[PDB]
Amino acid sequence: SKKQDENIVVNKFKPKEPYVGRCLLNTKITGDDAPGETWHMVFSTEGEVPYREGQSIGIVPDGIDKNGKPHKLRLYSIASSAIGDFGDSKTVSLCVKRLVYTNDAGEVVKGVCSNFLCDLKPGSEVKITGPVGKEMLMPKDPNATVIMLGTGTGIAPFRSFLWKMFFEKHEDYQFNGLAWLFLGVPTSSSLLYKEEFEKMKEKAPENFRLDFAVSREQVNDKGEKMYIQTRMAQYAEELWELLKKDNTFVYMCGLKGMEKGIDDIMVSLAAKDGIDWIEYKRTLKKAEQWNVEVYL
Amino acid sequence: SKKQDENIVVNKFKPKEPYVGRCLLNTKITGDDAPGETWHMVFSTEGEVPYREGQSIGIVPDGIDKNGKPHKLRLYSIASSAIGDFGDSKTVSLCVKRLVYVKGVCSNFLCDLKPGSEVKITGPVGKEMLMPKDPNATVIMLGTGTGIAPFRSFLWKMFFEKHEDYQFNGLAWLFLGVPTSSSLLYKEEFEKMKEKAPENFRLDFAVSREQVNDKGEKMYIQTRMAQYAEELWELLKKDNTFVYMCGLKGMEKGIDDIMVSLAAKDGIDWIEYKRTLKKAEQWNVEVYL
């Protein structure tokens, strides 16, 4: 197999009978001036949730909805590697964006689960379900080229991937390929886990490439906003050549819509090489080389 | 003082109003085959407990004494460096051996702690086991069992961390005495340090039930030290050599015995020489139980 799916597990816990964990730590990781708030939280699992890199867990926020029923679960990409941020395999971490926005009528909408999570305090209980998913599992090839394209909280599965690849010691996995992370955020105050990625860059300079795309601050030579695709375009030649290799796996995670901008740049890249990107993407997708997990 | 006591903090929290931390992790570090159990645990401190290498913290175990009052605090050498295992200055770690002699109250309470549970912390406590200020000093550490704790704290700052104001470039020599190989606390960390700083760190283990000297005698800590008699004595004659001893009360005896032999060669009386070292802050002892 091309992905690390050895004895994968899903749905050990269901919303009917969730696993009840406890918040150990909860930290706001964005600057006070960022457009929105993003928090990194660590939950105890007693090692009962058998998740792996790339999977998500469901969270059933406390309370009840308008029709007196428990809230439906919301999915969150796991931000920690399989062994957790403590390295003891007894925790799971999430990277949560507090959903708050004002509509056209001037009404403020506060997302139920995201605010519940960002409001959690050490010691409080949290209902967990899962693990969930297999679409974003890591490549099995330890020498593969792994291109990670994320926006906002989309960084989560990539933080999971990268901790295993560059910080952990495993008997059956020693990464020696090329990992390239592109992370798009609106402001520098919205950068997530930069300190961690910089450490990885210093530990493995030849196996890890790191590029941030701060859209409301940075611009390319022509003065265009630096969206993730805009940064990618600055490495058009390098990226296109990598995309033609069978050992190159691309992953995309984040807010739905980021997909359109990336297609635009890819359509141009392929075209210059006389290739139809739409068709090429289908090929990559079937070959398990184009993995997408975007959400509204 | 010759030790790192600048802006030192002691007794910020008292048993009357302890700091309430939370257990982040608790793992048994002794092998299943070891005769006893020793656990490494980490508590969150929100950075409210400004301790430093060599200090201890008190723990008021949950429960009541025979009169229904709170338990008296028990002291534990901090096993983590000042910035903690996670380098954010927001955690503290302990190395605790489960005591049975009846079940020891605090040691068993601590080893039973589960992630998420609260723990009452007092301190920081102590100034006796602080590190030398001289970054090029020779630091000899002699420990038995959990006595390894303050030395783990020392060594993490010396070899696992980068500090603009502190770059250790002297000689750190650790001697650790334990009963079995399955009781060699933090073995992997020390071996990593030796691989990282081969010229600044020396490491010697003394496993009493598995090793013996050329004379067939059990390899206690003093038995291993005796194999470096000449080297150690030469180091003990230098003004930049600081010795630290920590562990179970009684480990001092065997060490003095081999020392008398050392000093004897130079027409020196060990007991009095050790006293001059102690008063010069070069012989620091913290033994318990």
């Binding site: 150990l24 730590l25 930290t27 706001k28 990781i29 964005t30 600057g31 990194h40 660590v42 062994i83 941020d85 403590f86 390295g87 003891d88 971490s93 901790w163 910080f167 952990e168 010691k169 008997e171 520098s188 105050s189 919205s190 950068l191 997530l192 886990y193 930069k194 300190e195 961690e196 450490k199 530990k203 | 982040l24 992790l25 793992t27 570090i29 002794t30 092998g31 299943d32 490494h40 295992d85 996670f86 380098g87 954010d88 927001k90 993490w156 696992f160 399955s182 060699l184 606390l185 933090y186 073995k187 992997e188 960390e189 990593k192």
Partner: peptide, 26 residues
């Protein structure tokens, strides 16, 4: 099989946590 770990962070290359579980803000 490999011997049981006698240290708490043997899961990491450097034998210590690689970063804080309370990430630093930008």
């Amino acid at each position: 099989k490999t011997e049981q770990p006698l240290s708490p962070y043997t899961a990491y290359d450097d034998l210590k946590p690689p970063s804080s579980p309370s990430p630093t803000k930008p």
